[PDB]
Amino acid sequence: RADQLADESLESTRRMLQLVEESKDAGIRTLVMLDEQGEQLDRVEEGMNHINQDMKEAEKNLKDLGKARENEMDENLEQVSGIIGNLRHMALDMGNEIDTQNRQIDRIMEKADSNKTRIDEANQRATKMLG
Amino acid sequence: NRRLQQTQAQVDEVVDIMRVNVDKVLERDQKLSELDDRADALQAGASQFETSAAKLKRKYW
Amino acid sequence: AEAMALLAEAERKVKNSQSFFSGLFGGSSKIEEACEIYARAANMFKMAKNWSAAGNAFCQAAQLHLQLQSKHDAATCFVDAGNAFKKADPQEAINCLMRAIEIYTDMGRFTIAAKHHISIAEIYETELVDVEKAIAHYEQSADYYKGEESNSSANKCLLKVAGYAAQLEQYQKAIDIYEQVGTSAMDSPLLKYSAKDYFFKAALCHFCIDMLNAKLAVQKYEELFPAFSDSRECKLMKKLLEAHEEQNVDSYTESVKEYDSISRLDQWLTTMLLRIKKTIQGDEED
Amino acid sequence: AEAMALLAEAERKVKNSQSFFSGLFGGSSKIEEACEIYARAANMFKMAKNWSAAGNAFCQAAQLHLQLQSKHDAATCFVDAGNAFKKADPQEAINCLMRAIEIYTDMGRFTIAAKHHISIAEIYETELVDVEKAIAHYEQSADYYKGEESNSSANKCLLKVAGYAAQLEQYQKAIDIYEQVGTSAMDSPLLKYSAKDYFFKAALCHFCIDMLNAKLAVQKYEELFPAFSDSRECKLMKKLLEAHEEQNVDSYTESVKEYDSISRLDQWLTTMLLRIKKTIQGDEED
Amino acid sequence: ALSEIETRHSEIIKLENSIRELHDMFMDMAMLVESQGEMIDRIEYNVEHAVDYVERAVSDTKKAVK
Amino acid sequence: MAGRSMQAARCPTDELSLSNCAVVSEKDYQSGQHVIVRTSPNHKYIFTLRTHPSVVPGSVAFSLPQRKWAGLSIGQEIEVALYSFDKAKQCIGTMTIEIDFLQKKNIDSNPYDTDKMAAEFIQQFNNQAFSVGQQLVFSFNDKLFGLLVKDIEAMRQKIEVGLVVGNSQVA
């Protein structure tokens, strides 16, 4: 048991790597997207802004027209440590991407709604002058 | 030796980092989930405006 | 701006005009005016946290919107009604949502239809406790997701389907669902990661087979010992298969106690593991 | 509410009005009515799971939409049809997508064009099994991504290109891609750790060179000893470079067996490693 | 010294333990973020396209007054 | 007397668990009668009844060993019919038994006088039914064993099932 633990747990330290390494792989796909999506939402936000503009004009037109075993076991830890730093790297990129976009969602939701109203009002004045 | 009894918290601390990382992302899911029902539903009304604006074109233009 | 007053005037205008009122033109807008009224009512109803009334109010503005020809913004109202009743104290949360999907479906909006479809199957289970219909919805919903290229979500629902299917005796149908969701997961080497647990669940689900359906399912599983994710799936399974094939309700009951260390056993696993723990003793005493 | 009926009415209205029925103003509105008809049909064909019919229906509404002068919302239909045919039983899946890209591409929409371009190269591989055509698409698509300063997606495609390029035979053409995707990866400290595997792949790929292209590619790599990420990259490579430069196919196959412990190997690696195993055996008995 | 060798193991496992679970989170993570990634691919679609529907409307309205 | 449906149950107390007798209710059968349990068209077994104020009317309780031998389950449907032995051919006179420690939990190498066993064996299992290949438990000096009938001889014709009496020898 004594050795079945100083080695088995040692295998866990070795595994402790792929465990925190597979996490990076899982983090990459996330970050890679969070970044890709970040730029996407930029062109997406343009939509809420593009519509925000046109609607103003559209409304006006509708208004104008409407009217050594332990030595290694100690090293593996250092390995985990070096990787722990990485976990911080992603934790920040993921964090700064989350907070920057959440607030972006706010602006999107705002303008999107603001324009929704203009569409409804215009749709109630246009539907009548149909055909 | 001591590194073992020590490094133990070097991860228990990260276990907390992800605990928030898993939550942060999930919080965005709901923010984007609702935005998915108000943004898509938004253009839905725009479709009504596209049809209305198209007809006002075949009568006054 | 009295609530019940708005509810009254809204009724005063929600009706085909006639006499001098009808005048020259009809009133396709009257009905819309009424919708806006009831909405204004449900607003203050949601204010005083009287939700119930708010929901019943939205049901009115929504039903009226249909009598105007505007399925879109109408269905959205049915959603508002559902959210109200849901968070509210009465029921109706099920009716509004059904009346919402029929619209998102007929119109041509399956993305959102499935979005509310999962909410539905989720309520019909955690509330009404009607799994026989919940599964039906979880499934049809996953089908819609699987047609929107939306793979993940589709699987999200499938997991629910099989998950609650095995908790209803449908053990075999469950392993089959796990096989499908397992095959439609390898195509994405970005899912390789979760495709394990599926094999674990599927190997655990037993329709009382006398062959080695599990010893075979664990074999089909490509695993390498040095692997880590994998050690959290088949490794345990093998030991459980041996403890079953040897009618030993001790090695199994102790292996499930050990694995519970390296990997915490959720509710599901627990319930099923106990079902197998009884199949062993039952086979000992058969 | 019958699809078969709608498909008929649509036809009756989709046709450049003739005689008195035409007059002066064309049928720019009629063609649109037909599009709406077929759309409604494709819709109920999708709830019925008749997919085939759904897809062909969308194809109709789409083609007609083109006959209306609205490439945008048309192409959109082409995509819907593609999503139908894909999760269906007939073909057309490849045709609809090409018909969609020709539009997003000539309309000024490369972002989405590449989005479907990769989908295409993905289907032409996971279905048609046409690697050479798929590579061509993964490549031309990565050019667009890299143009939309989406380096990230660009590389996502390049990895595909090189990856399957080494499987076909193009070992050299593979390393070149790994070199490019490797130089354009260091400019982003968010890919440093991943930049290893690239050098591992590029060093593994051999176009039957006699020099030390690999012994040089491994040297170009910057590694030390107290690094653990790098441990899963070149450290092994050198051992393999020595097992190749000494025609010892048991030390190569023994080291692959050891490395398969600290970092479990995948299908790709396996296939290539065996290829290198055979080059060694073939140099021994010669 | 045994005592230290046994106490060592005790702390090592308690460490090994906390580790395995943290790994469990990423697994579920990659399954969540991806399930959300597809929920955005349609957004970008419905957005830049809605810009076309609105653009076509605002244009027709202008040429309906001049 | 033609046969009736019953429901298998668990043995009331341990005392009746060492008698190797099917415990029944006093509202159905009576102590001293014999029955033939039927689990399937090709599985017939014979036991001895022993009433008890705990058994519920319309059900027969069996011990752990019996359930393993007859392959019975707790809560299954079985048909029980009164069986009448023939004291002209089923009278046991020489029955060989295969004894061995029931529970491998307490296995010793101490000596056990057989003469004393055969004496207490008939003094407890008299006027009962025993079949070839049957499995039961023997309480000898607070020690539990696992008997296994190998051969039965009447008073020499080898029979399948017999009835142990007072003048019955055991090996």
Side-chain angles (χ1 to χ4, degrees), chain A, chain B residues 1-2 5-7 9-42 44-61, chain C residues 1-223 225-227 229-286, chain D residues 1-263 265-286, chain E residues 1-8 10-14 16-21 23-46 48-66, chain F:
Chain A
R1 181 64 179 182
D3 299 302
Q4 185 58 58
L5 295 171
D7 182 58
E8 180 175 60
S9 301
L10 184 57
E11 291 185 57
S12 176
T13 67
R14 285 191 171 67
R15 290 203 293 290
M16 207 175 283
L17 300 179
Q18 188 71 0
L19 294 171
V20 299
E21 281 303 308
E22 184 196 66
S23 62
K24 181 179 64 63
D25 296 300
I28 299 177
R29 297 189 296 291
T30 303
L31 300 177
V32 175
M33 292 192 272
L34 295 176
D35 183 298
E36 183 186 63
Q37 291 164 45
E39 302 296 359
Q40 296 188 65
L41 295 181
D42 293 304
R43 292 183 296 294
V44 172
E45 182 176 1
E46 295 183 297
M48 305 303 96
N49 299 123
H50 200 301
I51 299 176
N52 181 61
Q53 170 183 53
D54 296 304
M55 291 310 290
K56 297 181 62 181
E57 180 64 297
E59 179 60 59
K60 178 178 295 299
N61 296 123
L62 301 179
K63 242 180 177 60
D64 179 296
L65 182 57
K67 184 178 179 56
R69 71 188 65 60
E70 57 178 354
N71 182 58
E72 174 199 295
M73 185 184 278
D74 289 345
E75 180 181 62
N76 295 299
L77 301 176
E78 180 179 358
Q79 302 184 62
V80 179
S81 179
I83 304 174
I84 294 299
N86 177 300
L87 301 179
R88 180 197 61 177
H89 183 60
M90 303 184 279
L92 294 183
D93 296 306
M94 179 187 263
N96 293 61
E97 189 65 60
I98 290 173
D99 297 302
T100 296
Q101 288 188 55
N102 287 307
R103 184 265 176 168
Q104 177 179 182
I105 304 176
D106 295 302
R107 301 198 303 296
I108 300 178
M109 299 183 274
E110 293 297 63
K111 288 63 181 178
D113 173 64
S114 176
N115 302 307
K116 181 61 176 59
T117 301
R118 274 186 160 61
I119 301 178
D120 296 300
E121 302 181 62
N123 178 57
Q124 180 178 298
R125 180 67 66 64
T127 298
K128 295 182 175 181
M129 301 184 274
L130 211 66
Chain B
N1 184 4
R2 183 59 178 295
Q5 304 180 359
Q6 185 165 291
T7 301
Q10 188 176 63
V11 181
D12 291 303
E13 176 176 52
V14 180
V15 179
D16 305 0
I17 301 179
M18 297 313 297
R19 173 179 299 295
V20 190
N21 296 2
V22 182
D23 289 345
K24 285 195 178 70
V25 58
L26 292 176
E27 296 181 60
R28 303 184 70 278
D29 179 294
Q30 298 183 359
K31 294 179 179 298
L32 298 177
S33 179
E34 182 62 4
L35 179 58
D36 183 296
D37 291 60
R38 295 193 305 175
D40 184 53
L42 167 55
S47 180
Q48 292 291 298
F49 183 59
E50 180 181 60
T51 301
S52 299
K55 300 182 180 179
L56 302 175
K57 175 183 62 180
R58 297 188 298 296
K59 181 182 184 179
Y60 294 71
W61 188 354
Chain C
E2 307 179 64
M4 51 212 89
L6 304 175
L7 306 175
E9 66 177 2
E11 181 179 298
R12 287 185 177 186
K13 196 173 187 179
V14 61
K15 185 63 177 300
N16 298 5
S17 59
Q18 62 183 64
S19 185
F20 88 117
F21 189 58
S22 181
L24 178 165
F25 53 117
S28 295
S29 299
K30 297 178 177 59
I31 177 66
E32 183 171 59
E33 179 64 300
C35 297
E36 180 286 301
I37 300 300
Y38 285 121
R40 175 188 295 297
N43 182 303
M44 54 185 85
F45 280 129
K46 187 187 301 178
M47 188 70 91
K49 300 180 180 181
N50 301 1
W51 301 77
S52 303
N56 297 302
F58 283 123
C59 298
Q60 300 179 299
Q63 176 185 61
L64 305 187
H65 207 179
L66 300 177
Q67 304 177 301
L68 176 168
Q69 181 270 300
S70 298
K71 307 176 65 60
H72 280 125
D73 308 302
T76 71
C77 297
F78 291 68
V79 182
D80 296 303
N83 302 359
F85 288 117
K86 188 171 184 174
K87 170 59 181 59
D89 58 73
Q91 56 294 299
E92 299 297 62
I94 62 176
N95 180 299
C96 300
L97 296 178
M98 298 187 275
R99 292 294 305 299
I101 293 185
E102 63 178 60
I103 304 177
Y104 295 125
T105 298
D106 289 345
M107 182 60 86
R109 307 295 293 298
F110 288 113
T111 61
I112 196 64
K115 295 298 299 178
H116 291 57
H117 196 182
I118 58 178
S119 301
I120 282 183
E122 184 175 60
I123 302 175
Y124 284 48
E125 181 180 60
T126 63
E127 292 295 63
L128 300 178
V129 188
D130 184 47
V131 296
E132 59 179 59
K133 181 180 180 181
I135 302 177
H137 293 181
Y138 284 121
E139 184 183 301
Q140 181 176 59
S141 179
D143 296 300
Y144 296 122
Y145 285 120
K146 192 71 182 65
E148 299 300 304
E149 187 61 296
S150 59
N151 172 290
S152 179
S153 298
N155 303 56
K156 173 185 175 301
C157 304
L158 297 179
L159 295 176
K160 309 295 293 301
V161 182
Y164 303 123
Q167 300 296 57
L168 183 61
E169 183 280 335
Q170 299 180 59
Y171 297 118
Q172 58 177 59
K173 297 185 61 57
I175 70 178
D176 291 56
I177 302 178
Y178 290 123
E179 298 296 297
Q180 300 178 0
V181 66
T183 61
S184 60
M186 297 183 270
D187 185 58
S188 300
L190 301 304
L191 293 170
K192 154 185 164 297
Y193 285 58
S194 180
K196 314 171 303 175
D197 179 58
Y198 304 67
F199 284 112
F200 181 55
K201 293 185 173 300
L204 287 174
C205 303
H206 290 124
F207 58 116
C208 299
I209 189 178
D210 53 71
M211 293 185 276
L212 61 80
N213 183 297
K215 181 60 180 60
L216 185 61
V218 62
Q219 183 181 62
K220 297 178 59 61
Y221 184 61
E222 300 176 300
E223 173 193 57
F225 291 121
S229 299
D230 304 306
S231 305
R232 184 177 58 194
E233 186 290 301
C234 61
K235 176 54 184 179
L236 174 68
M237 186 53 67
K238 180 181 297 301
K239 181 60 180 60
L240 308 179
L241 302 176
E242 301 179 300
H244 182 62
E245 295 179 300
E246 299 180 298
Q247 60 180 59
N248 186 301
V249 62
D250 295 302
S251 300
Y252 178 64
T253 63
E254 185 153 56
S255 295
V256 63
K257 216 300 180 183
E258 299 179 59
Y259 179 68
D260 182 55
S261 302
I262 63 176
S263 300
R264 305 300 295 294
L265 301 175
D266 56 297
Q267 177 182 59
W268 192 74
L269 298 178
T270 302
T271 303
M272 183 172 273
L273 295 174
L274 278 51
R275 187 66 180 66
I276 304 177
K277 174 184 176 180
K278 301 182 65 59
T279 64
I280 303 178
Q281 301 181 240
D283 183 295
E284 296 179 297
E285 302 295 61
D286 189 302
Chain D
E2 299 176 298
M4 299 180 90
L6 300 177
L7 302 177
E9 299 184 301
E11 180 179 300
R12 296 183 176 183
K13 196 167 186 177
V14 55
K15 190 66 178 60
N16 298 6
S17 58
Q18 56 294 298
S19 61
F20 65 119
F21 183 58
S22 182
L24 192 174
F25 61 120
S28 293
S29 300
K30 304 178 187 60
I31 181 68
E32 182 172 60
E33 178 63 298
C35 297
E36 180 285 301
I37 299 299
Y38 286 121
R40 181 180 299 296
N43 182 294
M44 55 183 83
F45 277 130
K46 182 169 59 181
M47 62 175 90
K49 301 179 183 301
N50 300 7
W51 293 119
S52 306
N56 298 125
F58 280 122
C59 298
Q60 299 178 298
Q63 177 184 60
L64 308 187
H65 202 182
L66 300 177
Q67 302 177 301
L68 178 168
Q69 179 180 298
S70 301
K71 307 173 65 61
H72 275 299
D73 311 306
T76 72
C77 297
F78 289 66
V79 182
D80 296 302
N83 296 54
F85 289 119
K86 180 176 182 180
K87 181 53 183 56
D89 58 71
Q91 58 296 302
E92 296 299 63
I94 63 177
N95 180 299
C96 300
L97 297 178
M98 299 186 277
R99 288 294 305 300
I101 291 185
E102 65 177 64
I103 303 178
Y104 297 126
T105 293
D106 187 293
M107 179 54 86
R109 305 295 296 297
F110 283 120
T111 60
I112 190 63
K115 295 297 298 179
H116 290 57
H117 194 180
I118 58 177
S119 301
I120 281 185
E122 185 178 61
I123 300 174
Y124 285 48
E125 180 181 61
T126 62
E127 294 296 300
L128 299 177
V129 192
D130 195 308
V131 294
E132 38 276 303
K133 188 176 183 179
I135 299 177
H137 294 181
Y138 284 121
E139 181 180 302
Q140 182 176 60
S141 182
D143 295 302
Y144 300 121
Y145 285 118
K146 188 64 184 62
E148 306 302 301
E149 62 184 61
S150 62
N151 174 290
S152 179
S153 303
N155 298 302
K156 184 184 65 61
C157 303
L158 297 176
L159 298 175
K160 306 291 291 301
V161 182
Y164 305 121
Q167 293 295 59
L168 181 63
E169 188 287 301
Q170 303 172 60
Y171 292 118
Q172 183 185 128
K173 299 184 61 60
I175 70 178
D176 293 58
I177 299 177
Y178 289 123
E179 296 293 294
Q180 299 180 300
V181 68
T183 60
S184 60
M186 300 182 270
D187 189 9
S188 300
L190 247 177
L191 303 179
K192 179 181 62 181
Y193 297 70
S194 181
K196 306 177 304 182
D197 179 57
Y198 296 57
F199 285 112
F200 184 55
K201 292 183 173 300
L204 287 174
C205 303
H206 292 119
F207 54 107
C208 298
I209 193 66
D210 59 303
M211 301 182 276
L212 61 80
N213 182 299
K215 181 61 179 59
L216 177 57
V218 63
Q219 180 177 58
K220 297 178 61 60
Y221 185 60
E222 301 178 301
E223 178 194 61
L224 301 176
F225 271 119
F228 312 111
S229 300
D230 303 302
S231 301
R232 307 188 302 299
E233 197 289 296
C234 63
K235 186 61 188 65
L236 174 68
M237 184 54 65
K238 177 177 287 61
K239 182 62 179 65
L240 308 179
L241 302 176
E242 299 180 298
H244 186 6
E245 298 179 64
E246 286 189 54
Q247 60 182 62
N248 187 301
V249 74
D250 297 61
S251 299
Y252 178 63
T253 61
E254 181 178 299
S255 298
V256 65
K257 179 62 173 171
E258 301 181 62
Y259 178 68
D260 187 58
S261 301
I262 62 179
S263 303
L265 303 174
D266 55 299
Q267 177 181 56
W268 192 78
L269 297 178
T270 303
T271 303
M272 184 172 275
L273 295 173
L274 275 49
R275 187 65 179 64
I276 306 177
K277 174 186 176 181
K278 308 188 77 300
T279 61
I280 301 177
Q281 298 178 296
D283 184 294
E284 299 176 301
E285 302 300 57
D286 189 299
Chain E
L2 284 296
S3 181
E4 61 185 61
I5 302 177
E6 183 178 59
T7 301
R8 187 196 196 74
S10 182
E11 297 296 299
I12 301 177
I13 298 302
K14 298 175 65 179
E16 170 188 299
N17 296 125
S18 303
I19 303 299
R20 288 188 173 299
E21 205 183 309
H23 168 293
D24 291 300
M25 292 183 255
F26 289 80
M27 297 301 275
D28 298 299
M29 175 61 96
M31 180 180 88
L32 300 175
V33 58
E34 181 174 60
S35 178
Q36 302 178 63
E38 298 178 60
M39 297 179 90
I40 300 181
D41 295 358
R42 291 187 295 290
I43 300 178
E44 177 186 60
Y45 186 71
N46 304 2
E48 54 186 357
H49 269 296
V51 182
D52 179 60
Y53 302 120
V54 177
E55 184 178 64
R56 287 180 171 294
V58 62
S59 62
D60 302 359
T61 57
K62 296 178 63 61
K63 296 178 180 58
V65 298
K66 59 176 61 183
Chain F
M1 65 180 274
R4 61 184 302 179
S5 301
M6 300 299 268
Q7 181 179 299
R10 185 176 181 179
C11 182
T13 58
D14 301 291
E15 181 181 59
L16 300 176
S17 180
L18 302 179
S19 59
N20 192 31
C21 300
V23 185
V24 298
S25 180
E26 299 179 59
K27 302 180 180 60
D28 300 300
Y29 307 71
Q30 298 182 300
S31 301
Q33 298 182 299
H34 301 299
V35 298
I36 174 178
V37 182
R38 179 181 179 298
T39 61
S40 61
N42 301 59
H43 282 120
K44 299 297 181 300
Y45 304 70
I46 301 178
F47 298 67
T48 301
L49 303 177
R50 184 61 181 298
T51 61
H52 187 301
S54 62
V55 181
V56 181
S59 63
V60 185
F62 301 69
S63 62
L64 178 59
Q66 300 179 300
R67 297 177 299 182
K68 299 180 64 181
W69 176 58
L72 299 175
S73 300
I74 302 178
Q76 62 173 57
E77 179 179 60
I78 58 178
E79 299 180 60
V80 181
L82 299 177
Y83 183 62
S84 301
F85 284 62
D86 183 2
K87 299 181 180 60
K89 299 181 299 180
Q90 299 185 243
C91 295
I92 302 178
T94 301
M95 177 176 82
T96 302
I97 303 178
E98 179 178 299
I99 184 177
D100 179 60
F101 294 67
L102 177 63
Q103 302 180 299
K104 59 234 299 178
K105 307 297 178 179
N106 304 302
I107 300 180
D108 56 60
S109 300
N110 297 120
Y112 294 67
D113 184 298
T114 60
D115 300 300
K116 299 180 180 181
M117 303 181 93
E120 183 180 60
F121 182 66
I122 305 300
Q123 188 61 60
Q124 182 180 60
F125 296 108
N126 57 61
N127 185 60
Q128 292 183 56
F130 289 67
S131 301
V132 180
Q134 181 180 61
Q135 301 180 59
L136 62 171
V137 298
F138 191 9
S139 180
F140 186 58
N141 295 121
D142 301 302
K143 196 66 177 182
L144 302 177
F145 297 71
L147 300 178
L148 180 61
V149 182
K150 297 297 298 180
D151 182 297
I152 301 178
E153 299 179 59
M155 301 185 271
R156 301 180 182 180
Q157 179 182 300
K158 301 182 179 182
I159 60 178
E160 301 176 58
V161 59
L163 179 61
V164 181
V165 300
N167 289 337
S168 298
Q169 303 184 303
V170 183

